């Protein structure tokens, strides 16, 4: 029974809490206090292995403090989440990787790029563009919908496998 620490990061409104609550509680919260930053725990079987998931749903202001640095540093993998209909969030994905590589002191930190709200009728970020950025980073890319559960397990579980392969 292994303990895996996952940090879900992303810009304001992308669906971090929505995605996390779906994983933990199997329902869709279409409105959740955006200030609430919590840790959650879930036990799951991933490839026949009982896993202990410690998911940190980040929310707080993107402040750069020594506590926030080691608070993030405890994470083994990071879900980098943008919304497919929010270009500024996708442009943020670069800076997020930068902070991840800094506190972790590594160019090879387990990440998964998540395009959320892929249930939407339209979008302003095309899949090909994100896959390019994912390749240019050497990380997976998953489209998810916290509204319908599409790819939610796929996204989180894939971060776990990326953590496995790191040791």
């Amino acid at each position, epitope marked *: 029974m292994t303990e895996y620490k996952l940090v879900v990061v992303g810009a304001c409104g992308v669906g971090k809490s929505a995605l996390t609550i779906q994983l933990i509680q199997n329902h869709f919260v279409d409105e959740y206090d955006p200030t609430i930053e919590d840790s959650y725990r879930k036990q799951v079987v991933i490839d026949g292995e009982t896993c202990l998931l410690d998911i940190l749903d980040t929310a707080g202001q993107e402040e750069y*403090s020594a506590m926030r640095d080691q608070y993030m540093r405890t994470g083994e993998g990071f879900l980098c989440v943008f919304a497919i209909n929010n270009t500024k969030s996708f442009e943020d994905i670069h800076h997020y990787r930068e902070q991840i590589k800094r506190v972790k002191d590594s160019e090879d930190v387990p990440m998964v790029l998540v395009g959320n709200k892929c249930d939407l009728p339209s979008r302003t970020v095309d899949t090909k563009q994100a896959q390019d950025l994912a390749r240019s980073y050497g990380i997976p890319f998953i489209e998810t919908s916290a509204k319908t559960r599409q790819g939610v397990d796929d996204a989180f579980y894939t971060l776990v496998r990326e953590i496995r392969k790191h040791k």
Partner: antibody
Amino acid sequence: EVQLQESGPGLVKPPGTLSLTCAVSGGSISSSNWWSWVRQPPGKGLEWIGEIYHSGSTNYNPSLKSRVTISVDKSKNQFSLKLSSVTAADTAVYYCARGSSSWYDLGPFDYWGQGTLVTVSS
Amino acid sequence: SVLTQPPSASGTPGQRVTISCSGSSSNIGSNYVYWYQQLPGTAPKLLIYRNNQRPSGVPDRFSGSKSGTSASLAISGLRSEDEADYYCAAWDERLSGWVFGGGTKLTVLG
């Protein structure tokens, strides 16, 4: 950041049962932390009462075990304390607290309510 | 209280003051110690966690250590704003509960 607030009868008559409720906002009760009750007789030191996890598991101060019940009401995002057979020894300020983070341990009392004075008296 | 602290401590400003905390093999000897500072009429605030780590907002003149079944809080460069009550806490394996010291009231002299 999470915030806790105690509320309960200021006065409890002996034989009676002290009943308190901790309203929690800015954080889900289903988070991976432990929710504690701590008390402090006026002018004296802190005494841990007990703690509960959101699944329902509890650990009580063994010295209070036969009189303490702690509950969680996820639907109201509250946990609660019931302490039976009160005596004057239970007169104290009662605090609720969250701590014992699964993510990064800072100890058992990361966040405190303001505390409510309960007087036990005839 | 299960842990033992001196009820009071003194110091003139600028000095270094230490506050001791003694337990047994089943609490301090086995587990981490945590320190809390309580000001008049307010809830306690975490001061030191895991024997010697400082949370956000605790200056480096506060420091803690732990040896065997004893733990120690050190305050160097004592200031007037340090007048408070200081409490140690640890998990006790035999009681299966959190135990405290009785608390130390720190007075800044002069």
